[PDB]
Amino acid sequence: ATFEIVNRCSYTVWAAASKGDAALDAGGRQLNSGESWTINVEPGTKGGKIWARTDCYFDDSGSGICKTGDCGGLLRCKRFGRPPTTLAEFSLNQYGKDYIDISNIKGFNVPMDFSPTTRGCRGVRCAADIVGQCPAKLKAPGGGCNDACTVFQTSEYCCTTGKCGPTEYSRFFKRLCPDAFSYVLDKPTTVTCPGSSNYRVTFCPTA
Ligand SMILES: [K+]
């Protein structure tokens, strides 16, 4: 699959793409306002994620730190990023179908649209001012709005036993972004696309 990742924010983001134990394509890159990065993701990739990182510093060897979404201090991410991170998630070519979603399960940092550029399905978006409205206990100094599992580490918020319900904190995310996952056992907002679709991930889509 081809993913075009576009930064429509007025600020620089450092995009990242990983499946948890390996980079996808180059794994990360700086995107100034308006810049686009096209990556190729191998067919059959399960559990891929794309996210933005904010307020990064990197030296000439690609080592440093970001205030949101840092993946162990690397420009080119091999692992997933530290919350809070709005997540574009996908599994490709699973029995002839692609599955995509946006997730707020690891919090929110940057607004995002995740849309197919090929026919046969619809896109999803979370573009509300979650950071501005974020409850005080979830607000991350670095920027962003953490999920309640990250902050409080309870079995209920983290759904440790595979049994959990919605919470005041999950309902906050869901009210502002109904098409994104707000907790582990949320009614799925997963979209099913034809296998081998192509996609566009746009940061700050209403900017
Ligand atoms: K936006």
From Swiss-Prot:
GO (cellular component) term, any one: cytoplasmic vesicle
Species name: Thaumatococcus daniellii
Family per similarity comment: Belongs to the thaumatin family.
UniProt function note: Taste-modifying protein; intensely sweet-tasting. It is 100000 times sweeter than sucrose on a molar basis.
UniProtKB keywords: Cytoplasmic vesicle, Disulfide bond, Signal, Taste-modifying protein
Protein name: Thaumatin I
Keyword Cell membrane: no
Cell location: Cytoplasmic vesicle
Keyword Nuclease: no
One Pfam family per UniProt: Thaumatin
Covalent S-S links between cysteines: C9-C204, C56-C66, C71-C77, C121-C193, C126-C177, C134-C145, C149-C158, C159-C164
